[PDB]
Amino acid sequence: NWEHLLSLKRQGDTAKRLRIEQDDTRLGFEVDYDRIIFSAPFRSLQDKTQVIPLSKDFVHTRLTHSLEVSVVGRSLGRMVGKKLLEKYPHLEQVYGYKFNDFGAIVAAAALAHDIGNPPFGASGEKAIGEFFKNGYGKRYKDSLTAKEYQDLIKFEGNANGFKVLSQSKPGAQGGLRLSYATLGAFMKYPKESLPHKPSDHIADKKYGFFQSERALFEDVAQELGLLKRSTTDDVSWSRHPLAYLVEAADDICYTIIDFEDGINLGLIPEEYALEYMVKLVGQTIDRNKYNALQETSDRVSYLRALAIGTLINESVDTFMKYEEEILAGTFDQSLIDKSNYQAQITDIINLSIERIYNSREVIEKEIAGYEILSTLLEARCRALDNNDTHYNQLIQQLLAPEKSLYENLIQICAEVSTMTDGKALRNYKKIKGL
Amino acid sequence: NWEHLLSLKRQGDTAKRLRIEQDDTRLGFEVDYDRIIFSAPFRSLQDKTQVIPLSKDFVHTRLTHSLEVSVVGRSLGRMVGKKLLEKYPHLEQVYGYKFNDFGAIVAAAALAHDIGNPPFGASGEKAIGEFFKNGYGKRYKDSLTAKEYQDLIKFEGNANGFKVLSQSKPGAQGGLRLSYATLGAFMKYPKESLPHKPSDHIADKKYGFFQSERALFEDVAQELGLLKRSTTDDVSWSRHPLAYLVEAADDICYTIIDFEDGINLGLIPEEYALEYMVKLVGQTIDRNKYNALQETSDRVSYLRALAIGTLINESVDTFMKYEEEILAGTFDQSLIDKSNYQAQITDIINLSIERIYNSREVIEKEIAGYEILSTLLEARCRALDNNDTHYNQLIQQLLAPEKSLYENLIQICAEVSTMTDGKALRNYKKIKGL
Numbered sequence A, B: 001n002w003e004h005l006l007s008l009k010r011q012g013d014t015a016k017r018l019r020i021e022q023d024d025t026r027l028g029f030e031v032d033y034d035r036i037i038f039s040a041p042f043r044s045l046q047d048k049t050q051v052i053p054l055s056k057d058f059v060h061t062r063l064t065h066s067l068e069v070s071v072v073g074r075s076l077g078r079m080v081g082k083k084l085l086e087k088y089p090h091l092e093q094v095y096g097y098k099f100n101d102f103g104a105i106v107a108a109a110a111l112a113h114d115i116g117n118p119p120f121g122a123s124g125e126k127a128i129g130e131f132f133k134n135g136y137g138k139r140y141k142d143s144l145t146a147k148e149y150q151d152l153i154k155f156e157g158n159a160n161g162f163k164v165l166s167q168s169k170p171g172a173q174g175g176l177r178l179s180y181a182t183l184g185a186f187m188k189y190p191k192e193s194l195p196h197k198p199s200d201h202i203a204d205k206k207y208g209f210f211q212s213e214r215a216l217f218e219d220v221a222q223e224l225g226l227l228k229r230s231t232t233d234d235v236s237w238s239r240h241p242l243a244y245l246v247e248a249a250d251d252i253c254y255t256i257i258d259f260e261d262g263i264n265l266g267l268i269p270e271e272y273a274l275e276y277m278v279k280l281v282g283q284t285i286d287r288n289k290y291n292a293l294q295e296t297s298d299r300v301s302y303l304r305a306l307a308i309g310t311l312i313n314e315s316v317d318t319f320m321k322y323e324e325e326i327l328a329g330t331f332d333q334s335l336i337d338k339s340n341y342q343a344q345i346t347d348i349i350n351l352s353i354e355r356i357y358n359s360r361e362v363i364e365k366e367i368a369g370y371e372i373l374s375t376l377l378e379a380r381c382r383a384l385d386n387n388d389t390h391y392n393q394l395i396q397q398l399l400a401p402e403k404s405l406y407e408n409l410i411q412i413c414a415e416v417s418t419m420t421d422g423k424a425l426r427n428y429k430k431i432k433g434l
């Protein structure tokens, strides 16, 4: 039920924090927002790849993408919360909740939803995985549990993001110490790395936490009241209802903005821009304003602003139509896939894949990223092995100012993923002496 | 009075927008926030100098600084608005205002408060001015009005920010079309470029708009009901009350974060970090937590988080103590200057000036920036003069995809200030063929 889903608990708490005992100027979710804003992991997003590597231009990075997702998520959360308190009046009438709380939760979750991504993006994650699969790290296969090896060979940015958010350090336990509602709404694949893709459900495409933090998530999963889907030997719970909204906001934003940026770069003609969006923007377009503009940028910006407004309302309608199934855990798709504009979205995505992801420029950067990440990971792993050599001591002093082998390897992968693109490239040249 | 200060009017409006007729999910100030978030001028802040040029590291840029100022400003606005509606109940009881509106106004104003700054920062502005003062642009002195020449030789980032926010383009008038309350709260020097520093008041140190937009500000200044301070031949109004809060937030944030970054870089020892902040953090510090931490970063982050919380409350107290004078226009200082911690702030600022601004690293970058900006401005100005040469046509096609001389020169200065540091450097090398 909804009372346990909006928990204000933080790690290490003993008492019970109640909504009616909060300070209304600064609620806990706003504190979460402010704690994410002021941290270094959030700042490192400014020079991390969204689509085009090493482009910190007029193209998007992870930071600006996260900000746009935050705005869209705040809007979605406010509408859905107003409709929910309309449906269940006891929430507001007894517990003391307002529709701004839902917006704060979704905004905070959407702000930190990519905070664990490594440099170079998808190619970076695949390179980290291939290093342990077919490279040097393969030699560790026999020393590790099967699920730990699966963690290392299918490295996921979501698990690393959870690790960053809930990291324990000497003298400061809990990390950022976010609320449990925010951690639940941030969590989109509540399962371990094995088994690999059991079903066709949407919460099974990947995994969301490592083996070193499973216990932590267990605590979270038992406070919110999430339904359990497996207890044999591998735990898996159902989604928090607001993770659907977070995912919808992320999908809308990147789907539209990638097209707009590709048009502005010179890779997609504007005829496609009008053709694939006339249906989306037809219900609110004022042709006069469209015909007055004299630049491609103004036209594409107008079209994007209209399309986002249409899609947000459609998503809210879908969520309120399937609320019961979502709360019961039986809803196996995304809110976007149940929309009237699926064909247009698929056409835009296919055009983006053909014209942007496979561009020469984009390709060369990913190959360079593969080389850089492999070099840095091999250096760290060889330093971890010997430990007695002078060279090993130098590498330790440069790249790292009692734990198990799995903990050491996962820490190595986490430290590689903190770097930006430029810092990784600079370290690569310094290692090579170039 | 306060009823006219919180105006929801936009440029080109004919009717009257009322607060009670708004959609509560998305008020106008949130629309302003979202319009700033999604624009290209805001995105260009990601690679612009805050203190250390060409450092897009773990140091701050203009974008992250603006986000932190937005958080602090939202908090300040919420507290001040709650106290105001406590003082004047008729606002809420009749007009229908809530204390979140003040926070939205201050957050939107603080988000765009540096949007007109050029690359390389203060050195960049001084280079643009010196170009017209002692360089090529001096030849235009005889063709321009005195106030226009003063505009060109004392180039200000605030005037350029107003120009960016309220720019008119073919087919889209008004630019971002922000609310008038937001434009007033963004405006901190409501005067022209002449006379130069008439008095010791705080609204006279600089100027806030160009001659090409004076008329525009007049409209704004007459809708809010701002008091007039000069009508002889040069217009000058008093400050919007919330500009004080915007300035306080900006001062707090940069004053603390510059010290923290200098400590993390290796230019200031940590002994000073404890010595100059023990008084600030003494009222809420838990020594146990401070002694548990084992890294400099954790300690300085803790101290910064405590200091910001102390300063915010002190600023709110000062504002509510001098509200009457501020509303009457007789308050001639800043809220920070009337605080109990002025000595500590001055010590930290002096240490920052001695240790960070005059570092070798910082110095070399500013000299390079002077060279780059002078080259680009001279190229644009020589292209504007001749117009018939083949080279001039090439420069026009590269650097610029019926107006007066002053309009052309101010547009040149505005187009130079859109570039980031990296883009300016790349264009400089391409001009030199290197």
Ligand SMILES: Nc1nc2c(ncn2[C@H]2C[C@H](O)[C@@H](COP(=O)(O)OP(=O)(O)OP(=O)(O)O)O2)c(=O)[nH]1
Pocket: A050, A051, A052, A121, A122, A250, A254, A255, A258, A357, A362
């Ligand atoms: N360059 C490049 N970019 C890609 C490729 N595949 C995806 N992208 C970029 C384009 C999208 O804007 C961006 C979205 O990345 P996400 O990790 O957020 O993807 P997704 O929504 O599938 O999220 P997920 O990790 O599955 O939850 O990734 C690729 O093969 N090459």
Ligand SMILES: Nc1nc2c(ncn2[C@H]2C[C@H](O)[C@@H](COP(=O)(O)OP(=O)(O)OP(=O)(O)O)O2)c(=O)[nH]1
Pocket: B050, B051, B052, B121, B122, B250, B254, B255, B258, B357, B362
């Ligand atoms: N590198 C360098 N940075 C400087 C210098 N002077 C100021 N800064 C940097 C440090 C501060 O964090 C930052 C603040 O710039 P602002 O333009 O916001 O200054 P201010 O608050 O005086 O604002 P204003 O334009 O007068 O309203 O400028 C300087 O001489 N060199």
Ligand SMILES: Nc1ncnc2c1ncn2[C@H]1C[C@H](O)[C@@H](COP(=O)(O)OP(=O)(O)OP(=O)(O)O)O1
Pocket: A071, A072, A075, A304, A305, A306, A308, A309, A312, B031, B034, B035, B038
């Ligand atoms: N409903 C929404 N909620 C949140 N963000 C939105 C919404 N609609 C659009 N956005 C995003 C993308 C837009 O570029 C930006 C500004 O929105 P907005 O100013 O309402 O768009 P617009 O130009 O279509 O305006 P209007 O509807 O007044 O004509 O915010």
Ligand SMILES: Nc1ncnc2c1ncn2[C@H]1C[C@H](O)[C@@H](COP(=O)(O)OP(=O)(O)OP(=O)(O)O)O1
Pocket: A031, A034, A035, A038, B071, B072, B075, B304, B305, B306, B308, B309, B312
């Ligand atoms: N009152 C405030 N309003 C807005 N932002 C604030 C405030 N105080 C601090 N900040 C900024 C700077 C902090 O690094 C960041 C997070 O604040 P916060 O979590 O309250 O600080 P803290 O670590 O001192 O916590 P606490 O008071 O719970 O011990 O937000």
Ligand SMILES: [Mg+2]
Pocket: A065, A066, A069, A113, A114, A250
């Ligand atoms: Mg994302």
Ligand SMILES: [Mg+2]
Pocket: A305, A306, A309
């Ligand atoms: Mg709209």
Ligand SMILES: [Mg+2]
Pocket: B065, B066, B069, B113, B114, B250
């Ligand atoms: Mg600033």
Ligand SMILES: [Mg+2]
Pocket: B305, B306, B309
């Ligand atoms: Mg605090």
